[PDB]
């Protein structure tokens, strides 16, 4: 197997994790299981704690910073760790029993169970014009040394790392998302009928989207060209609320539809951060520099669910538009963008770009 690890500035403490991206379904959220490597001597009476903070921050770009003008803690989990507290139990995973057996007796576990209805790692990077500042929800994991819970943590024998809560939806049976609209122009009842659909409801980053477009032109006019697009919507709903709208895929085609005839065709679009990096105003599931970052996924939410608490709500839509020679006639279908998915330690730091 493969495990990521990071040590405190003074290599006296070291965290070990088997993933840096935890996949949350709807039912459950993959458990966050790891272990710390301690120096019992180096710390007399001092202890080892590990906590999991989940918070929304606005201003600078990473929670652990001193330039953000707003912050709301959405979750906190503290754990007693070096001094094994019989109180604070666990069964123990098996990347653990394994790990502990390769690190020794100074190896200590910890486990976090992230509630299911918490927002997932989403980051929105405002661009050049946009008057808003950066913001996002991050999951900080920290293991530090101290006597009491309260003494003062020091950026030295302490370690922090951002993990990620990524959303996975399985794709059900259901009907393909459809949309249609009829249009009658001035001086005539002859209609121009538009109707589109997507091959499915759920897609994953990198996965192509097929759009079945059908056009029934009873009109005496002509459809010059057709434009297909995929747009993202990001609603920052906490400190300073605002709504960002941004196209992540377009595909205009000079397809013609003559008077009194029926048209038909299948278009293929691919929303991607790569062909959008540049762009800014959109929501991502991480930082840009970080390779391994995608477009923010669709914020799932429920009945009687608190929207503000989610931080940034993200959604996608496919828009079909006919330019009729005007008032183009158009429809839009909504879809859900989701996430896919001998030891030998490896750094934790996320791989970079170019
Ligand atoms: O479909 P297009 O020919 O590409 O025009 C669209 C678009 O909508 P249209 O179908 O509606 O006229 C927007 O109008 P709405 O979708 O909001 O109704 C508009 O967005 P805003 O006017 O809300 O800003 C956006 O411009 P932008 O990307 O600056 O938001 C612009 O996009 P296109 O040139 O990029 O495709
Ligand atoms: Mg599926």
From Swiss-Prot:
Q: Which UniProt keywords apply?
A: Cell membrane, Cell projection, Coated pit, Cytoplasm, Cytoplasmic vesicle, Membrane, Nucleus, Phosphoprotein, Protein transport, Signal transduction inhibitor, Transcription, Transcription regulation, Transport, Ubl conjugation
Q: In which tissues is it expressed?
A: Beta-arrestin 1A is found in cortex, cerebellum, striatum, pineal gland, retina and heart. Beta-arrestin 1B is found in spleen, lung, pituitary and kidney.
Where is it located?
A: Cytoplasm; Nucleus; Cell membrane; Membrane, Clathrin-coated pit
Q: What is the effect of changing residue 348 to A?
A: Abolishes interaction with AP2B1; no effect on interaction with CLTC
Q: Does the keyword Transport apply?
A: yes
Task: Report the residue ranges where the short sequence motif [DE]-X(1,2)-F-X-X-[FL]-X-X-X-R motif is annotated in this entry.
Answer: 342-352
Q: Can you list the disulfide-bonded cysteine pairs?
A: none
Gene3D superfamilies given in the database record = 2.60.40.640, 2.60.40.840
Q: Which residues carry this modification: Phosphotyrosine?
A: 42
- Kindly list the GO CC terms recorded for this protein: clathrin coat of coated pit; cytoplasm; cytoplasmic vesicle; cytosol; nucleus; plasma membrane; pseudopodium
Q: Where is this region: Interaction with SRC?
A: 1-158
Pfam families with a match to the protein in the record = Arrestin_C (PF02752), Arrestin_N (PF00339)
Provide the effect of residue 156 to Q.
Answer: Impairs InsP6-binding and oligomerization
Q: Where is this region: Interaction with CHRM2?
A: 40-81
Q: What does the entry list as the binding residues for 1D-myo-inositol hexakisphosphate?
A: 245, 250, 319, 321
GO molecular function: any one? phosphatidylinositol-3,4,5-trisphosphate binding
Outcome recorded upon mutating residue 231 to Q: Impairs InsP6-binding and oligomerization
Self-association and partners: Monomer. Homodimer. Homooligomer; the self-association is mediated by InsP6-binding. Heterooligomer with ARRB2; the association is mediated by InsP6-binding. Interacts with ADRB2 (phosphorylated). Interacts with CHRM2 (phosphorylated). Interacts with LHCGR. Interacts with CYTH2 and CASR. Interacts with AP2B1 (dephosphorylated at 'Tyr-737'); phosphorylation of AP2B1 at 'Tyr-737' disrupts the interaction. Interacts with CCR2 and GRK2. Interacts with CRR5. Interacts with PTAFR (phosphorylated on serine residues). Interacts with CLTC and MAP2K3.
Q: What does this protein do?
A: Functions in regulating agonist-mediated G-protein coupled receptor (GPCR) signaling by mediating both receptor desensitization and resensitization processes. During homologous desensitization, beta-arrestins bind to the GPRK-phosphorylated receptor and sterically preclude its coupling to the cognate G-protein; the binding appears to require additional receptor determinants exposed only in the active receptor conformation.
Q: Which family does it belong to?
A: Belongs to the arrestin family.
Q: What is known of its domains?
A: The [DE]-X(1,2)-F-X-X-[FL]-X-X-X-R motif mediates interaction the AP-2 complex subunit AP2B1. Binding to phosphorylated GPCRs induces a conformationanl change that exposes the motif to the surface. The N-terminus binds InsP6 with low affinity.
Q: What is this protein called?
A: Beta-arrestin-1
Organism, as annotated: Bos taurus
């Amino acid at each position: 197997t493969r495990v990521f690890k990071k040590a405190s500035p003074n290599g006296k403490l070291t965290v070990y994790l088997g993933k840096r991206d935890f996949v949350d379904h709807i039912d459950l959220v993959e458990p966050v299981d790891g272990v710390v490597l301690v120096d019992p001597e180096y710390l007399k009476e001092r202890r080892v704690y590990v906590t999991l903070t989940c918070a929304f921050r606005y201003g600078r770009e990473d929670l652990d910073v001193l330039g953000l003008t707003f912050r709301k803690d959405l979750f906190v989990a503290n754990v007693q760790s070096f001094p094994p507290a019989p109180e604070d139990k666990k069964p123990l995973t098996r990347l653990q029993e394994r790990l502990i057996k390769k690190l020794g007796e100074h190896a200590y576990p910890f486990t976090f169970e992230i509630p299911p209805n918490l927002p997932c790692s989403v980051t929105l990077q405002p661009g050049p014009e946009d008057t808003g500042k950066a913001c996002g929800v991050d999951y900080e994991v920290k293991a530090f040394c101290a006597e009491n819970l309260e003494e003062k943590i020091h950026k030295r024998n302490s370690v922090r790392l951002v993990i990620r809560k990524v959303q996975y939806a399985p794709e059900r049976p259901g009907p393909q998302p459809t949309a249609e609209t009829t249009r009658q122009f001035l001086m005539s009842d002859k209609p121009l009928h538009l109707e589109a659909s997507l091959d499915k409801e759920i897609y994953y980053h990198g996965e192509p989207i097929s759009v079945n477009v059908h056009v029934t032109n009873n009109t005496n006019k002509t459809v010059k060209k057709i434009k297909i697009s995929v747009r993202q919507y990001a609603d920052i709903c906490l400190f300073n609320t605002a709504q960002y709208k941004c196209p992540v895929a377009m595909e205009e085609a000079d397809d013609t539809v003559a008077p009194s005839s029926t048209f038909c065709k299948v278009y293929t679009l691919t929303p991607f951060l790569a062909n959008n990096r540049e762009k800014r105003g959109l929501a991502l599931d991480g930082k840009l520099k970080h390779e391994d970052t995608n477009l923010a996924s669709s914020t799932l939410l429920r009945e009687g669910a608190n929207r503000e608490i989610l931080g940034i709500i993200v959604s996608y839509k496919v828009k079909v538009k006919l330019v009729v020679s005007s008032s183009d006639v158009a429809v839009e279908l909504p879809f859900t963008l989701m996430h896919p998915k001998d030891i030998v330690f490896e750094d934790f730091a996320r791989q970079r770009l170019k």
